[PDB]
Amino acid sequence: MKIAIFGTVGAGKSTISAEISKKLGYEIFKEPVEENPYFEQYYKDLKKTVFKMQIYMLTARSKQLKNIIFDRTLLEDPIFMKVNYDLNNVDQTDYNTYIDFYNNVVLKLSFDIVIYLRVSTKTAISRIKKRGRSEELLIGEEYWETLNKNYEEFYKQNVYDFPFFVVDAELDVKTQIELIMNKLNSI
Amino acid sequence: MKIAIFGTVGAGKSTISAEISKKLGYEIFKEPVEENPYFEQYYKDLKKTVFKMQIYMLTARSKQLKNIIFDRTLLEDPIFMKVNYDLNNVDQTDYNTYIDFYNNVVLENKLSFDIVIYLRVSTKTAISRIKKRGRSEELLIGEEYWETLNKNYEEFYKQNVYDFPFFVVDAELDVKTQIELIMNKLNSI
Numbered sequence A: 001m002k003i004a005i006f007g008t009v010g011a012g013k014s015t016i017s018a019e020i021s022k023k024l025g026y027e028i029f030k031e032p033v034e035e036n037p038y039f040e041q042y043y044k045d046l047k048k049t050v051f052k053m054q055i056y057m058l059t060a061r062s063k064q065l066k067n068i069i070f071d072r073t074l075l076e077d078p079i080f081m082k083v084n085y086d087l088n089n090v091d092q093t094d095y096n097t098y099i100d101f102y103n104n105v106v107l108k109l110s111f112d113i114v115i116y117l118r119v120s121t122k123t124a125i126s127r128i129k130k131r132g133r134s135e136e137l138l139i140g141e142e143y144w145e146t147l148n149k150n151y152e153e154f155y156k157q158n159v160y161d162f163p164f165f166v167v168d169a170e171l172d173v174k175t176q177i178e179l180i181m182n183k184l185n186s187i
Numbered sequence B: 001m002k003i004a005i006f007g008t009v010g011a012g013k014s015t016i017s018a019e020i021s022k023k024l025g026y027e028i029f030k031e032p033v034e035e036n037p038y039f040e041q042y043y044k045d046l047k048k049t050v051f052k053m054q055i056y057m058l059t060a061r062s063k064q065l066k067n068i069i070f071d072r073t074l075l076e077d078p079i080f081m082k083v084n085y086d087l088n089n090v091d092q093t094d095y096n097t098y099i100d101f102y103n104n105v106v107l108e109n110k111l112s113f114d115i116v117i118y119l120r121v122s123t124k125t126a127i128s129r130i131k132k133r134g135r136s137e138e139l140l141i142g143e144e145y146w147e148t149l150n151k152n153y154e155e156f157y158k159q160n161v162y163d164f165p166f167f168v169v170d171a172e173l174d175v176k177t178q179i180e181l182i183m184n185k186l187n188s189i
């Protein structure tokens, strides 16, 4: 069973992953933020850092690819590039470069279930504040709201093409996990 | 037969490719500079443009990969990143990113050549060929760039000499001679 955990920043992906790991005994595929050489400076200037960061993300995720829970997937990385292009942090040319580059260089990738931890931006932000990553504290709400909208739109455009299972991430973790295990056991 | 044409800027790769195409009737794998959306601004500020340009180069070359003469190869692209790192146009982190990215994304996703023709050329001749061609963009950077690149081409060759079927051609010789030496070599294999 290949379990994808899908959702925006502050959705609770790593918490949910850990809880599923506890119950099934599965390995978690994580990409640790502390090992990301770009993270410290990323949010200080998006215009300067985005492209470099997003190529790094593709690389790192690909090496992990060479019974699993995926704490965020490679499907999600282009969402972050799209958001920065929407917010003019990336121009048309750089976006084309990455996009073409994503399909013709980066792009098995099969998941038994893609768990979409759908969450309001408000809750996502307060989870971000609670966690207290200094780097994430810097950018404003518009960034988070744009990203969330982009996560929902990715989901709507791809709903038929992946085995999505939507989880209300406003619910408390015990409930989320109970709904997730019930779903996993039924398949 | 897969023919790789290998050499620095102004070595005469595209001229040699065309001449070999004429004699064998082969398709030439080119990456046109006029179709490169980064080229116009690339040389104006290397610090700003290099990383973006070099990822673009990897992408473009990979799509061409999906009886051939290769007018420059994918083996050569990292040479240009190395040169910009040597000249502090790229920092350690960005260089690591690309380098790891080159092996774990690009290389990983054949790349086999029957011959890798190294058009070895002095920097002086390479520069005067650059000036003659008259690409405004290339006219902008100084000699130190070209000399660094040439040294880096020679070093790549020396480090990889045993691992590829290199055939060295003196690119100071005139084209008719180069081509005659190349055809003699091709026919013998």
Ligand SMILES: Nc1ccn([C@H]2C[C@H](O)[C@@H](COP(=O)(O)OP(=O)(O)OP(=O)(O)O)O2)c(=O)n1
Residues within 6 Å of the ligand: A007, A008, A009, A010, A011, A012, A013, A014, A015, A031, A032, A033, A053, A054, A057, A072, A076, A077, A078, A080, A081, A136
């Ligand atoms: N393609 C990507 C992927 C991630 N990030 C950024 C957004 C986050 O600030 C950080 C990733 O943090 P985590 O992996 O810890 O996961 P999240 O922060 O999304 O939270 P959670 O996993 O709890 O939902 O990297 C990015 O800019 N572009």
Ligand SMILES: Nc1ccn([C@H]2C[C@H](O)[C@@H](COP(=O)(O)OP(=O)(O)OP(=O)(O)O)O2)c(=O)n1
Residues within 6 Å of the ligand: B007, B008, B009, B010, B011, B012, B013, B014, B015, B031, B032, B033, B053, B054, B057, B072, B076, B077, B078, B080, B081, B138
């Ligand atoms: N990885 C790469 C590959 C190429 N270039 C640059 C150097 C040249 O200015 C231009 C390539 O132009 P051409 O394709 O015409 O190559 P040359 O000029 O090297 O060909 P020739 O040997 O015929 O002079 O792109 C680069 O910066 N990085």
